[PDB]
Symmetry: none
């Protein structure tokens, strides 16, 4: 029974690592995870194109809320982090009025525009922000703020 205890201690090591890893994910990086996706808040004030490049560098894109569950998760994430606004992956940069997600997939029936939005304010708003409530608002791409990236587990 020499290997028995070596392996018991091994189990302990793996348990330990799992716990510390979970800690790093939750307490430090404050990440958010679904069954199929990971969501990450980056607390660096940037402009839209810079943000999309930063998300891409991390091997992801700006977050795309295509359904209620995602959007609600993002809203909760924003809530706990205690922020008013972040960039997300929606824009009508190519064709004004025609909004699309960061991956170029077209806009659909689901949305979360705040009342009166999108309003293309001063004909200079082609990017999209999410606010505390979870609602969307179009804003100027040259605006600078924090952002959220989205990752596929593939």
């Amino acid at each position: 029974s020499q290997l028995r205890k070596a392996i018991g201690e091994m189990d302990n090591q793996v348990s330990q690592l799992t716990s510390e890893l979970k800690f790093i994910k939750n307490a430090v990086a404050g990440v958010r995870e679904t069954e199929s996706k990971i969501y990450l808040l980056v607390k660096e004030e940037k402009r839209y194109a810079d943000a999309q490049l930063s998300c891409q560098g991390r091997g992801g894109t700006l977050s795309m809320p295509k359904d209620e569950a995602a959007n609600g998760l993002m809203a909760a994430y924003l809530a706990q982090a205690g922020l008013a606004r972040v960039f997300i992956g929606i824009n009508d940069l190519e064709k004004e009025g025609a909004f699309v997600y960061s991956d170029h997939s077209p806009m659909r029936t689901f949305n979360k525009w705040r009342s009166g939005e999108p309003n293309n304010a001063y004909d200079e708003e082609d990017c999209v922000e999410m606010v505390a409530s979870g609602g969307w608002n179009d804003v100027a791409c040259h605006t600078t703020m924090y952002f959220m990236c989205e990752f596929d587990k593939e």
Copy 2:
């Protein structure tokens, strides 16, 4: 046959432990004792908010119950280049009677600055740590960065 398989697994866990240790120390710049982990949160908050934030992370505001802990926190504060942070000490329930965040009572060990605690203007029921490592009572509604503490259960 099973021995070398186990050895190779040992190698894998060694590897993972090392990379994880790297992530903890070099990247996240956290601080670790044999039994505890300490984390600086650089978000300006009021005391109760800070404590809630620590709790949400499954911890509490840092409790320096001995010299080693306190000195560690002081060094951490030094490296981060900060003047003050909230820590887990208060006399919110009974004025003059200080306690740690986990409600465990105050002891002989302390690191009060000269003249502290002074309950300035009868509105100071929370505690800050400063660069030197000394303590000071301050108003709970004050807003600043804070330090959380985590047990390795």
Copy 3:
């Protein structure tokens, strides 16, 4: 077959940790890794000596580009991170004109000095910066900017 499943599940745990660890390295910390080394950008404006101390506290040193591959990696890292300049581990602090790496190992034939560099401008330039292009330039040690640390895998 009770032990079989416990072992299978532990295996799953180790695979899982491997993936999540890789994620934390790449997506969160945005580090760059070679077979033998890890490179880390620190986004805190500091002076050379402070930067070196910070790297040391992390158990490393300021980055040392001793060959073309390293230097090019550092350059790409800088580029994507969207930075103009960072400190690196090169200086002639001890003996003017005689440049050395942070680990005190002497300068060699390989270099990436910009045109006209190093020029010891106003006899007050004893530290080295890397710029977007990947080129080197000597600068005053009292200058404040971001820096890059380098780590051995042992």
